[PDB]
Amino acid sequence: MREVISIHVGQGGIQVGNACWELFCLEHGIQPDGQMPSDKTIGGGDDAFNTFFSETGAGKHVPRAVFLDLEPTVIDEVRTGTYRQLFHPEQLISGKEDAANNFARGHYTIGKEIVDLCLDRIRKLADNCTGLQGFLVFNSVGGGTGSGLGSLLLERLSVDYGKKSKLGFTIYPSPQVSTAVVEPYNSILSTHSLLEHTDVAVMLDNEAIYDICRRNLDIERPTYTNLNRLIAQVISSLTASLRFDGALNVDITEFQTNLVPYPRIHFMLSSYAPIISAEKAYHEQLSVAEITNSAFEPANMMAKCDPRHGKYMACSMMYRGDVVPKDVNASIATIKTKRTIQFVDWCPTGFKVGINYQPPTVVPGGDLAKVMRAVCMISNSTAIAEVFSRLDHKFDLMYAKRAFVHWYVGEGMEEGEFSEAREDLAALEKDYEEVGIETA
Amino acid sequence: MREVISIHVGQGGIQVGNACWELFCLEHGIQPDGQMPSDKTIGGGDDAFNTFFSETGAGKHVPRAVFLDLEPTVIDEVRTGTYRQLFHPEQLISGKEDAANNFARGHYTIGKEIVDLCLDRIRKLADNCTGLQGFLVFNSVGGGTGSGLGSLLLERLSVDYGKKSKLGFTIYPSPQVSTAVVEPYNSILSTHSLLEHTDVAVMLDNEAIYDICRRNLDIERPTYTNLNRLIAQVISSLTASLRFDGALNVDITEFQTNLVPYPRIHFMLSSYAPIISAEKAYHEQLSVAEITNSAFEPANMMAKCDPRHGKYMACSMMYRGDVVPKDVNASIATIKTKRTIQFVDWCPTGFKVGINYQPPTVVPGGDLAKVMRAVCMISNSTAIAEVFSRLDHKFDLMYAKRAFVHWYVGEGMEEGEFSEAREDLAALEKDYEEVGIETA
Amino acid sequence: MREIVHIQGGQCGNQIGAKFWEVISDEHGIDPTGTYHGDSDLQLERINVYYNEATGGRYVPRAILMDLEPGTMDSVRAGPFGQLFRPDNFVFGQTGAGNNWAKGHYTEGAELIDSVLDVVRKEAEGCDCLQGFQITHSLGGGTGSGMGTLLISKVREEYPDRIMETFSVVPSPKVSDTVVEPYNATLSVHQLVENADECMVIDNEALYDICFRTLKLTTPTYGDLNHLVSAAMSGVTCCLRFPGQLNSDLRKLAVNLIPFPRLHFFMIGFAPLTSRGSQQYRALTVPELTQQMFDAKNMMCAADPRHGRYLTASALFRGRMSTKEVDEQMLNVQNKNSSYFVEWIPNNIKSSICDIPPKGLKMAVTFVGNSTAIQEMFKRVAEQFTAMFRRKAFLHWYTGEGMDEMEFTEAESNMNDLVSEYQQYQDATA
Amino acid sequence: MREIVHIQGGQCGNQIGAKFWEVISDEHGIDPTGTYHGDSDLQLERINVYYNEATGGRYVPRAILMDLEPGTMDSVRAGPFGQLFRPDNFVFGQTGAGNNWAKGHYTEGAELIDSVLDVVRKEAEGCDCLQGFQITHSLGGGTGSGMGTLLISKVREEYPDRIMETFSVVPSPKVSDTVVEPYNATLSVHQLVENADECMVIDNEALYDICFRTLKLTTPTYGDLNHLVSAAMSGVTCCLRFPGQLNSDLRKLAVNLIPFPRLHFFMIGFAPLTSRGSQRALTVPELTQQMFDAKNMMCAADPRHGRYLTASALFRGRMSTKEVDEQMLNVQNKNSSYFVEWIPNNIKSSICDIPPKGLKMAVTFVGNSTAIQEMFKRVAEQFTAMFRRKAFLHWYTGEGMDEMEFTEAESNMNDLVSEYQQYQDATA
Numbered sequence A, B: 001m002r003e004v005i006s007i008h009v010g011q012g013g014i015q016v017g018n019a020c021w022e023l024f025c026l027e028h029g030i031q032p033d034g035q036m037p038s039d040k041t042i043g044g045g046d047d048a049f050n051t052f053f054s055e056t057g058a059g060k061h062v063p064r065a066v067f068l069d070l071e072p073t074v075i076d077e078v079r080t081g082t083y084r085q086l087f088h089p090e091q092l093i094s095g096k097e098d099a100a101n102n103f104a105r106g107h108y109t110i111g112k113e114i115v116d117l118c119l120d121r122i123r124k125l126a127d128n129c130t131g132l133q134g135f136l137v138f139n140s141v142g143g144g145t146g147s148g149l150g151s152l153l154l155e156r157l158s159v160d161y162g163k164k165s166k167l168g169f170t171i172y173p174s175p176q177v178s179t180a181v182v183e184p185y186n187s188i189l190s191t192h193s194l195l196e197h198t199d200v201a202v203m204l205d206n207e208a209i210y211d212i213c214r215r216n217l218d219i220e221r222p223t224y225t226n227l228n229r230l231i232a233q234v235i236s237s238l239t240a241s242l243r244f245d246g247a248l249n250v251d252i253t254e255f256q257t258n259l260v261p262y263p264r265i266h267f268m269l270s271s272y273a274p275i276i277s278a279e280k281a282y283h284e285q286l287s288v289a290e291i292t293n294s295a296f297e298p299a300n301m302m303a304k305c306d307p308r309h310g311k312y313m314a315c316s317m318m319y320r321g322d323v324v325p326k327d328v329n330a331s332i333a334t335i336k337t338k339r340t341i342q343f344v345d346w347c348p349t350g351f352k353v354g355i356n357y358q359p360p361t362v363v364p365g366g367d368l369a370k371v372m373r374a375v376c377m378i379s380n381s382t383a384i385a386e387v388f389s390r391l392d393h394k395f396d397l398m399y400a401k402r403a404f405v406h407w408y409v410g411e412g413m414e415e416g417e418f419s420e421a422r423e424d425l426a427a428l429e430k431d432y433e434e435v436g437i438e439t440a
Numbered sequence C: 001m002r003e004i005v006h007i008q009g010g011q012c013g014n015q016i017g018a019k020f021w022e023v024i025s026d027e028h029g030i031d032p033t034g035t036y037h038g039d040s041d042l043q044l045e046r047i048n049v050y051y052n053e054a055t056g057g058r059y060v061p062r063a064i065l066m067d068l069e070p071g072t073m074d075s076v077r078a079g080p081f082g083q084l085f086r087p088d089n090f091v092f093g094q095t096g097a098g099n100n101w102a103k104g105h106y107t108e109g110a111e112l113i114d115s116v117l118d119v120v121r122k123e124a125e126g127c128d129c130l131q132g133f134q135i136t137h138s139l140g141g142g143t144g145s146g147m148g149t150l151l152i153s154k155v156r157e158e159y160p161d162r163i164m165e166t167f168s169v170v171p172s173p174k175v176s177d178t179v180v181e182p183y184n185a186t187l188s189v190h191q192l193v194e195n196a197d198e199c200m201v202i203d204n205e206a207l208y209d210i211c212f213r214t215l216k217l218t219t220p221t222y223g224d225l226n227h228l229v230s231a232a233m234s235g236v237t238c239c240l241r242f243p244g245q246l247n248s249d250l251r252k253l254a255v256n257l258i259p260f261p262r263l264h265f266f267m268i269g270f271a272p273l274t275s276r277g278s279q280q281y282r283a284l285t286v287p288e289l290t291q292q293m294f295d296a297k298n299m300m301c302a303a304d305p306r307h308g309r310y311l312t313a314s315a316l317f318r319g320r321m322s323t324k325e326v327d328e329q330m331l332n333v334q335n336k337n338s339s340y341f342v343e344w345i346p347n348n349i350k351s352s353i354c355d356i357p358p359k360g361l362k363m364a365v366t367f368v369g370n371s372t373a374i375q376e377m378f379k380r381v382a383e384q385f386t387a388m389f390r391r392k393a394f395l396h397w398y399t400g401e402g403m404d405e406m407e408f409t410e411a412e413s414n415m416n417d418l419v420s421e422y423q424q425y426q427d428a429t430a
Numbered sequence D: 001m002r003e004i005v006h007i008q009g010g011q012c013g014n015q016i017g018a019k020f021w022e023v024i025s026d027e028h029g030i031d032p033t034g035t036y037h038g039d040s041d042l043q044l045e046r047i048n049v050y051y052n053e054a055t056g057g058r059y060v061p062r063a064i065l066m067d068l069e070p071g072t073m074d075s076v077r078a079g080p081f082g083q084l085f086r087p088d089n090f091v092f093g094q095t096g097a098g099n100n101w102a103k104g105h106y107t108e109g110a111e112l113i114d115s116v117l118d119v120v121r122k123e124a125e126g127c128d129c130l131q132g133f134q135i136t137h138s139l140g141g142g143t144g145s146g147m148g149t150l151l152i153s154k155v156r157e158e159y160p161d162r163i164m165e166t167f168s169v170v171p172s173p174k175v176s177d178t179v180v181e182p183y184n185a186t187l188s189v190h191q192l193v194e195n196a197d198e199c200m201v202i203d204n205e206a207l208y209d210i211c212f213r214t215l216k217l218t219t220p221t222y223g224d225l226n227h228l229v230s231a232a233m234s235g236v237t238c239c240l241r242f243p244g245q246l247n248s249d250l251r252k253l254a255v256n257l258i259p260f261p262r263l264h265f266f267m268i269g270f271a272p273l274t275s276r277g278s279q280r281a282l283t284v285p286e287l288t289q290q291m292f293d294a295k296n297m298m299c300a301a302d303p304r305h306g307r308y309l310t311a312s313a314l315f316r317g318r319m320s321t322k323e324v325d326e327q328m329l330n331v332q333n334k335n336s337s338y339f340v341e342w343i344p345n346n347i348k349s350s351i352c353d354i355p356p357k358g359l360k361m362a363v364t365f366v367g368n369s370t371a372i373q374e375m376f377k378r379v380a381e382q383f384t385a386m387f388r389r390k391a392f393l394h395w396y397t398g399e400g401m402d403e404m405e406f407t408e409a410e411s412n413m414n415d416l417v418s419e420y421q422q423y424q425d426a427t428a
């Protein structure tokens, strides 16, 4: 019944996770103990949660989510947190020693020990689930655990579970702002694995979302926790159709069909539009036609690819709140007419729309305004190629010198695996132009 | 629905703006919060405001106005003011460093950074607008920002929005009283850009309006704030026909058709007639036929051009209050009979008229009497040439010495651009005599 | 039957229509909510002429209120009897003509007319027998002149046989309440003379004169000017709506008023109008009303008939008057005005009698006069237009919309041909 | 008798049906709990046409609510008159088609239909004499299109003689609320043209246009667009349910609307619909004008571009049959261009003494025209641009469909567009 297993791998994954499960808990009205207060004298929000939480039968709801890290610190913060009594102890899997920003540790040395225990936990969660929709996965491709073990998981999940959709929300390293020096190496080795085993991969670059906070929320000094809250609102809006009733319902299995036109092209962008500080919310109309235009703004994209370079191959507009399908109609129609927004020839109709009545929740202490309308647009653009070319350029500077390879080779990754990966990503950015080329 | 975007560029532009929006807020009954109090148990002044204010849908009305300055001080005074909660934070655009009375800074160096953000704000406002009537623009051609960026805006608006009328209320420096030494240089470089990109330019010289305050309001010591209030009353009277019901209705698109006889002759004067101190409002009759004769007084002209030298090419009388079209009839007819008022042979049917039933609003703390009649005459006169000839003379003294050019050239204005500008204004004052010449 | 479809085009047109449909509602006893509350059954016998009977015994005017300005709807709704008009019939643009014939004819108005024609066709087909149309528009403005003339061209191509009557406010040089009036009005008459069967030229100058002299109003408003136009408008088409000792109709007037096709400009004028403090002294008799209807003062056109010579005239007397006494007066006038009546075509004046008077009056008259004086009002527009066109002033607006200088020259030529032809039939002796 | 089995297939169909079974219930006086609370005995004389009388004197829609998504059950239950439908007739999968025609026809759909057919067989046999079915399904999605066409194919092989009616929502290029709409619709019409008797094409584009122009709605939702489709769906099959001065039925319409077997796509249009403010004299000529207005047709294609091969009006209420006929004649003399030269007296007429609730007179129009081309060319042009590059094709290929199907679907659809165009230009 619309069940979604959430796999949070690595620090970025878990910490994004924490923010997601705050939002979900508030949305379904689950308290930190994991007991919803039985109010309105009717089960009015009954079965809404069954997407993300599993009723224990004793009145305790448990998140359908595996938090996985090779490092104990991040998962320990969850265990010594407000939601300590929410998450099932076995689901919160820990490692003793971190991958230390090395794909190889995460893919071979350390990962192979922990993946065995994780899959067992996923099988136990998949047994409880009746008509599972898909696997949402959260991994940082800059970091070791998220790259290495997070890739190894997806490979193993693809054989075991087969059809069940794997939607991967990935935190690709922004080119200007990088947290670690060895990120390019990790990213590329991760992407080659991810290129085969994921169905749809939603790309998010921290720097891009950092710029959105400074521009829309008007915070001079954004944190990761402020960032993770915007990521959560996107995920909420995407799965929303399942949890809450809507006019034009979507599903995680639908995006798959409507967004990836060729198997390898499964990389996407995202843009939740009504990101507004309650300061400037006073003075904004916030009509549907504005929210749509605000979604297709080059700046409001949460990955830092400027889609004006590319051509939109498919768009998946996901509206929430006081949204009329007539009003959505004109808004798309005006976007189809605009020059700045350009569509591939071979996609003559390139809009999947989804309209939920449920408006988005305002998280307390949360940098957002309570707004009566919204939209999360996941877009397949030819512009994505630009991010991959920069990560290829930034990598090709390395592996000319063999710049950090001794680490990766020492931990079980043959040197030819780097050359393989770069060759396959070079084959991707060949494909992305080829589809971009007008029909012959 | 009769929407008018108001672009306030430069100190003079913003400070004039403030005074305009005090008046507009009082006229439509909008309070400083932005919420009209719902009184008379009917929406009686409902849709009146839609000209100037956009309903947000929550009972807050936002001004359709972008306040632009390269300097943060003037826009900061609006943000720390009574109308702080009226104006959209984004609409109030700021710069870090001022153009410093240098067109070149405003046109190239600084202006090119900010204009990008302004146009986005104009597009968002233009999207909300359904059947926009035109762009009212308020700049000071003596100053840097208003000359430089204000010109750059109009160029960029002309390509983007095309047909939509651009009525420019400009504060041309009075010859006797000048605030800055480098004014002539700015003015001429601004006028060449303004000569092409504006549809109708209404000229207002501060000294002229200062004299009107000393003569009509009987204030020994007028300020800018007293001046700005008289400017607001004119703008109110011009856009009145849209906002309030009238017998003979005009529109911003009409004046265009009924004032500029040739594309380059779009410069105009203006004269609001019943400017009366409540002190002498006792002794006066204030009939329509006196108000009209008080509009064609050479002194009451708000730009300091004496129209007795020139010939009236067109005239647009805009009455307000207890005005009968039979009474207006005899008033124009007597003016057409007068000798002092002279008309070009090629416009024998002078005087467009517009009659609104709404009388003008008496602003509290405002140097004016509550009067049951009014008129704002915008006039195309061959006398305008005189102002341009003085600004050309005052400029020709400069650029004989290359007097201040080093500043403008240092900030990316090629020296030949000055010579270009002077040649084009010399070509204007040729045209103004040519039309003034009687038919062959 | 003999139904009449009204088109009130342009601000001036709508405001005339508003007052007109108030005036006709009083005579037919229709209340502002569309219910009949009249006392006499004569008030509903021929109501179908102007009103189409809606469901629930509501009466809806057969009016097509067209403009390019949306603000004009609010004004005709605001007016008393504003609810009468059916909401579908209201067809309004957004931008407005901008006192520009071109914008209202070639561009903005060229887009709207296709929507109006669909309403015109709809109301025209509903009639079993269409008498024709009464278009009320101003030649001076952009909308009324532009769309008015473009609609008039369109309706005539579809319905050639059906009468096309036009009550048009011509711009007067005294008022000159717009600068570009001469251009609008010159381009208008060119279209009107080819496509209008009978044009009744109205002027604000004359209407004000009737308000400052014939009536004694301290404050004559556009309300009162419209009231006079309306009063006449009823008169022109009464013998349709009511019985008569001698019956007439629009085609009958046209047949006797228009000697040659191009001379269909007439001067309307209402006779029983009196100052409220000059009503005791005045006696209400056929001779007294005949004196006022032939007084050059009474005419709602600037040009005095004294300068011209009546090619013909038509009186539509109201109430219970002896037809002999009427006929005696019409004869008497013609013997008096030897010079002012054309030598050829004797017995120049036509007379129609309608039994039913206007409300609160015992007798009344409406006058329609084809004279060579009307020329003189068109010369004013020509003299004023030429002066502007000598130099190509305000032309770039009209040229901007995509009208060519060739159109302005052909408009002046065609109006100069009208002026020559009236001067021919004035000077002509036979 | 002359009973009709309704199959509301896909999220679109289940919503159209939900509103239809509200509308039809009001006409027959049936309350949301199934009990009869009507004031006229005429409301129950021909109820058995659509309902199966249950024990305790309850009335049940002959409605088989099929889908591949179990969330659409919670929609039609939530709705008022949701308790009318038989829970055994509800047939719902788990996964969902995923706007994929291949999934809803060849795999996921091919495993449910065997359960649906058993229910169709059950409700079809219970009728003494079956007039036909009235499937309602979008050609835009995967469930409505896939299962819809597969069911339609199955029920035709079993019941060849019975009338297969199909009120189908075609994807409009203006709306375009799904990306792979063209692929679904193109594969859909290939099956429909073979295995449907009459297919009343509907468009959301035309239904929005009626709500913004003909009616003046400030916020037209999918409930209001449904409320129009239902009014028409009532009007097509009325003379079955009520007496007539001149009666009709589905077969009678089909025999007079389908000149040749492959030309059975029609434009439906309900006449007396008016803006609430603009409430017009209600006479047969005033209604005849609006049903023939190219604004009123619930199909993006304006008849004016095409020519009516034939028409059919199903007038409602107490009207003079002479006055109706006069108006039908009059229309054909005006629109000499918009009525095929051969086959004279193109327009059929039908009268039904009983009007719809809260109206004195009404109409329901049905027009087989060569304009209907101009809505299948849009789907063709779009579909072609996609299939040149084999875009989004690995989905449909992956569910065991071949590239041979997609080509014959374009072939068979281009043959239809060829066939109408022939009869437009044809002069006899």
Ligand SMILES: Nc1nc2c(ncn2[C@@H]2O[C@H](COP(=O)(O)OP(=O)(O)OP(=O)(O)O)[C@@H](O)[C@H]2O)c(=O)[nH]1
Binding pocket: A009, A010, A011, A012, A013, A015, A016, A069, A070, A071, A098, A099, A100, A101, A102, A140, A141, A142, A143, A144, A145, A146, A147, A171, A172, A173, A178, A179, A180, A206, A224, A225, A227, A228
């Ligand atoms: N949005 C967000 N991204 C984060 C956060 N923490 C880390 N990241 C991203 O992850 C990258 C660093 O990788 P980590 O997630 O720390 O590494 P890991 O996958 O846990 O594996 P190890 O390197 O072995 O610890 C950064 O470049 C960020 O892009 C966080 O709190 N929020």
Ligand SMILES: Nc1nc2c(ncn2[C@@H]2O[C@H](COP(=O)(O)OP(=O)(O)OP(=O)(O)O)[C@@H](O)[C@H]2O)c(=O)[nH]1
Binding pocket: B009, B010, B011, B012, B013, B015, B016, B070, B071, B098, B099, B100, B101, B102, B140, B141, B142, B143, B144, B145, B146, B147, B171, B172, B173, B178, B179, B180, B206, B224, B225, B227, B228
């Ligand atoms: N009426 C009026 N005119 C003003 C006012 N302030 C400045 N001006 C006019 O503007 C000229 C000076 O230009 P500013 O407005 O200071 O310059 P700016 O366009 O803001 O550009 P910056 O120099 O970059 O600040 C004076 O000569 C006046 O003509 C004011 O408060 N009222």
Ligand SMILES: Nc1nc2c(ncn2[C@@H]2O[C@H](COP(=O)(O)OP(=O)(O)O)[C@@H](O)[C@H]2O)c(=O)[nH]1
Binding pocket: B247, B248, C010, C011, C012, C013, C015, C016, C097, C098, C099, C138, C140, C141, C142, C143, C144, C145, C169, C171, C175, C176, C177, C178, C181, C204, C207, C222, C223, C225, C226
């Ligand atoms: N008699 C009369 N004339 C009017 C009225 N309103 C406007 N006019 C005249 O119409 C002319 C302009 O035409 P108008 O119809 O207002 O402009 P349009 O709507 O753009 O065609 C002016 O010169 C006025 O003298 C009115 O109520 N009565």
Ligand SMILES: Nc1nc2c(ncn2[C@@H]2O[C@H](COP(=O)(O)OP(=O)(O)O)[C@@H](O)[C@H]2O)c(=O)[nH]1
Binding pocket: A247, A248, D010, D011, D012, D013, D015, D016, D097, D098, D099, D100, D138, D140, D141, D142, D143, D144, D145, D169, D171, D175, D177, D178, D181, D204, D222, D223, D225, D226
């Ligand atoms: N009239 C109407 N059309 C709808 C509705 N919902 C969806 N549609 C249309 O049907 C198409 C999607 O079909 P849907 O039934 O949701 O997908 P399916 O379940 O895979 O067939 C879109 O092109 C929509 O325009 C509705 O409630 N009413």
Ligand SMILES: [Mg+2]
Binding pocket: A010, A011, A071, A098, A143, A145
């Ligand atoms: Mg870590």
Ligand SMILES: [Mg+2]
Binding pocket: B010, B011, B012, B071, B143, B144, B145
């Ligand atoms: Mg300044």
